[PDB]
Design a protein around this ligand. Structure first.
Ligand SMILES: *[C@@H]1O[C@H](CO)[C@@H](O)[C@H](O)[C@H]1NC(C)=O
Lengths: 814, 74, 91
């Protein structure tokens, strides 16, 4: 399917006058040339010339063809080709003795260039001595343009079992007309001319005298370009005479696109030739038996028990050293610093809320310790270290409902959770035993986009709700009492708190946006500019803490953490919970009926974990390494259960935080995402720092609560870039004249996008209203009811081509 | 291999160049026109049928075109 | 300036005597909002989000639109005092 092509020229060495064969260019689906230094240039496509191809055709219409030659060595091939040249009266008998000595000559590769000092073009003469060309020369085009590591890449690009072709060029003053010789070996055989171990199948030999409008390097390039095509190579594999080769060459030239010189070429008109070439390519495969090229799975059902687990282990673990090593950039440190605040603040908020909700049966210290434990364990033993675990909202409402039901029935709260965890352990073992996660394949882009957009919208609304609460706590009055005690909390309003908080948030957001924009600017040396823009969030945070720390009299709400490693409620709880019973015996009916909430917990965790893993690990976000699904689920449920045994709460992967973490460890190209930095160190550092947060009272005591609001708004706004549903909503307002050149705009009508997006937005509105409904626990169910809609209802309204064009598994490919 | 519409298009393309029309205005015989025609065709490039995507191949040809034009106006 | 305590038995008939709690910060907020809105509408004039006639007429009155928005905003606020323009009574 692919071969190796080597251009050889007869050159002369500067040190002592003698002739040798020198390589000049290589072809593995692309052309590479070598300069005077001895280093090959950058890969590029091949662009031949009119005269070279014209003379190639002229010499090939009458050149000889040798098929199925039974030779292995160079001497026999040269003798046979010279005999065939003599037979057809193309070369004189008195010239063979010189030609055989000229051809059977030493071949030198690039490694011997500096050992000789460089090479120059040479011309053979009747005597046999090198000579300078008589016609004037000019610098070659490819070596002047493109030439101003690689061998290993050459070694893998060649297929393990394939053939090679060699093309030889050279000028001879004692000849009449140029001659071309094409020979195909019966069996691929090695040759001493090429040091590469690839065997050789075809051989071209090109001779002739000097004449105007003939350049031998360019014609050799043309021959190599002709040989590089797959269709012509197959034709050569099946050719029986010269007529078929002539017809193939005529077809190759017929479906070729030549463009003339112009005065002021422009990239706008030049992009009107995109279809035309395609059509020509189609014509090239209209008469070709082959088909055009440019027009294992992480998940698969397995017949053996626990196949997915071992598959993921063997697929992931061999990258451990690379994952450890890849964390030596300061961008990782900046991302760690960012995620530290981004993970502590919701943890503190949820810990406080649960503290006032369950009468301090569940507090802050327990959940932070649990978070550290399930983060460190998942970072050491996980397959995808880009996920961040943490508490969520549905977990909170579930805990509230469970506590209310237990209060109604009169049962304990911390005791039933142990049996809940036991049932979760049994369910997760049963599910992983049957590897029933393949259902994730049924989820297309539709529900994923819906979930991401609704989560981001809820995040933004929560941030604004906290800010409006900050105003409502201290309204705008004319008189304020100064004799108020503020030790637990300031009683009564204060003069300048809300406005200062709003100003601080605006400053944080504005500085973050300015640094983000300046990162892509061109205002400094590249290293310094990238380093400065890499630390935008800590820079803004430091500037704002200096600014408000300079302010003395005004009060702003600050971060608070518990004092020490103490349980939330030492009055009725201990470090170890007795499963049998603390104050009252646990009823048999309660353990036998505890299976019901475990199902809901498992369903919630399952759905959120796989949808988050799908969103983070999309192929579009230049994710080269694979992502495991079953082992990560096993880990998260296992640590959740073991934490529930000790009384600490279970957690789950967080969508927004993980997406921001992925975006932080993203290297962009000058735009295009160049690569993503994958490592495990960030999780360990985050877990260690959140664990040590109790030891850093002086630092967190000076951080206001309002500054992190700007950071939250920044994260919420930034995490909406990759969403395509948001782009379609933006296109709902643009006129059809300014729509982009994506396929799903041209292929279907505009009001069809409007109908699709309207149905989707109705689905989101239903999700929001059921979220606000007190029967919020039935929120996931309708979500899975979205699955039939794409599989059944949409083909009843749209068509298969349209549905494949909109709900495409790939973004660029549709 | 003769489509007269394409031949007329080629003649129009020849006439569309500044240098060729300047030489035709300054011409006095057929040899000068032949020399101008060969000079015009010397700075033209052929793109073979390649299996690469169309967009990258079409945007990669800008520098060689710049080189050809820079050699043309010398 | 910003202090911890302010006297509330202060005459405000001729001009503001003594410091006041919420004047400077609200004034700064108004300025920042006005500048941000003016820049946003100036940019939106050159955008491609509406029919050309409607987009151009909307962008043409960007500065008065921002001014009217902010006068509505501070007019809705009642208790705090903000400095206003004063003109001579007659010729
Ligand atoms: C701890 O729990 C007991 C009984 O549930 C309760 O009386 C006490 O107030 C709790 N301690 C708190 C809320 O600090």
């Amino acid at each position: 399917h692919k071969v190796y092509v080597e251009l050889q020229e007869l050159v002369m060495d500067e040190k002592n006058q003698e002739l040798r064969w020198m390589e000049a260019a290589r072809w593995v689906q692309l052309e590479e040339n070598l300069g005077e230094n001895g280093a090959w240039g950058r890969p590029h496509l091949s662009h031949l010339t009119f005269w070279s191809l014209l003379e190639l055709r002229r010499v090939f219409t009458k050149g000889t063809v040798l098929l199925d030659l039974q030779e292995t060595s160079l001497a026999g091939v040269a003798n046979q080709l010279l005999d065939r040249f003599i037979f057809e009266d193309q070369i004189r008998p008195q010239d063979r003795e010189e030609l055989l000595r000229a051809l059977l000559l030493k071949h030198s590769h690039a490694g011997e260039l500096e050992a000789l000092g460089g090479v120059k073009p040479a011309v053979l003469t009747r005597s046999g001595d090198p000579s300078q060309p008589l016609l004037p020369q000019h610098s070659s085009l490819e070596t002047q343009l493109f030439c101003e590591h690689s061998p290993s890449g050459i070694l893998e690009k060649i297929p393990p079992d394939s053939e090679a072709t060699l093309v030889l060029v050279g000028r001879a003053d004692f000849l009449e007309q140029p001659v071309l010789g094409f020979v195909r070996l019966q069996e691929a055989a090695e040759l001493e001319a090429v040091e590469l171990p690839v065997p050789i199948r075809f051989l071209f030999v090109l001779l002739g005298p000097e004449a105007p409008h003939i350049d031998y390097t360019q014609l050799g390039r043309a021959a190599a370009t002709l040989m590089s095509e797959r269709v012509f190579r197959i034709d050569a594999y099946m050719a029986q005479s010269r007529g078929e080769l002539l017809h193939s060459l005529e077809g190759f030239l017929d479906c070729s696109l030549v463009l003339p010189p112009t005065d002021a070429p422009s990239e706008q008109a030049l992009l009107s030739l995109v279809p035309v070439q395609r059509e020509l390519l189609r014509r090239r495969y209209q008469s070709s038996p082959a088909k055009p090229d440019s027009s294992d799975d992480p998940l698969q059902q397995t017949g053996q028990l626990f196949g997915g687990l071992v598959r993921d282990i063997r697929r992931r673990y061999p990258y451990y050293l690379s994952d450890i090593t890849d964390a030596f950039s300061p961008q990782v440190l900046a991302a760690v610093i960012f995620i530290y605040f981004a993970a502590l603040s919701p943890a503190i908020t949820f810990g406080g809320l649960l503290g006032e909700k369950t009468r301090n049966q569940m507090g802050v210290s327990e959940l932070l310790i649990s978070t550290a434990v399930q983060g460190i364990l998942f970072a050491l033993l996980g397959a995808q270290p880009l996920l961040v675990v943490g508490f969520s909202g549905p977990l909170l409402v579930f805990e509230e409902a469970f506590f209310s039901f237990c209060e109604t029935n009169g049962l304990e709260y911390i005791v039933g959770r142990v049996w809940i965890g036991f049932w979760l352990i049994l369910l997760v073992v049963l599910v992983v035993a049957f590897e029933g996660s393949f259902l994730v394949r049924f989820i297309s882009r539709y529900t994923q986009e819906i979930f991401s957009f609704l989560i981001s919208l809820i995040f933004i609304y929560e941030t604004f709700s906290k800010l409006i609460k900050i105003f409502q706590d201290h309204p705008l009055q004319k008189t304020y009492n100064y004799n108020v005690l503020m030790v637990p909390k300031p009683q009564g309003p204060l003069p300048n708190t809300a406005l200062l908080s709003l100003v601080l948030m605006a400053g944080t957001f504005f500085f973050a946006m300015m640094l983000r924009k300046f990162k892509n600017s061109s205002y400094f040396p590249g290293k310094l500019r990238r380093v400065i823009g890499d630390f935008g969030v800590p820079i803004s945070i430091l500037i704002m803490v200096l600014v408000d720390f300079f302010i003395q009299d005004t009060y702003t709400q600050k971060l608070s953490v518990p004092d020490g490693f103490k349980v939330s409620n030492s009055s009725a709880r201990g470090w170890v919970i007795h499963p049998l019973g603390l104050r009252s015996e646990f009823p048999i009916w309660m353990m036998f009926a505890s299976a019901l909430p475990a199902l809901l917990v498992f369903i919630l965790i399952f759905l959120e974990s796989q949808i988050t893993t799908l969103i983070v690990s999309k192929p579009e976000r230049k994710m080269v390494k694979g992502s495991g699904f079953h082992l990560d689920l096993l880990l998260v449920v296992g640590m959740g259960g073991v934490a529930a045994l000790f009384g600490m709460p279970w957690l789950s992967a967080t969508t927004v935080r993980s997406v921001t973490h992925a975006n932080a460890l993203t290297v962009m190209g000058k735009a295009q995402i160049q690569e993503v930095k994958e490592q495990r160190i960030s999780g360990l550092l985050v877990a260690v720092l959140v664990g040590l947060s109790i030891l850093m009272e002086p630092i967190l005591s000076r951080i206001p609560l309002a500054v992190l609001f700007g950071i939250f708004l920044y994260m919420g706004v930034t995490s909406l870039s990759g969403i395509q549903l948001f782009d379609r909503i933006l296109l709902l307002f643009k006129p059809p004249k300014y729509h982009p050149d994506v396929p799903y705009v041209k292929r279907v009508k505009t009001w069809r996008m409007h109908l699709f997006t309207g149905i989707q937005i109705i689905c989101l509105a239903v999700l929001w209203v059921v979220k606000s409904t007190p029967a919020s626990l039935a929120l996931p169910f309708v979500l899975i009811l979205t699955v039939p809609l794409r599989r059944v209802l949409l083909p009843l309204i749209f068509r298969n081509v349209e549905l494949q064009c909109l709900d495409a598994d790939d973004a660029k490919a549709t």
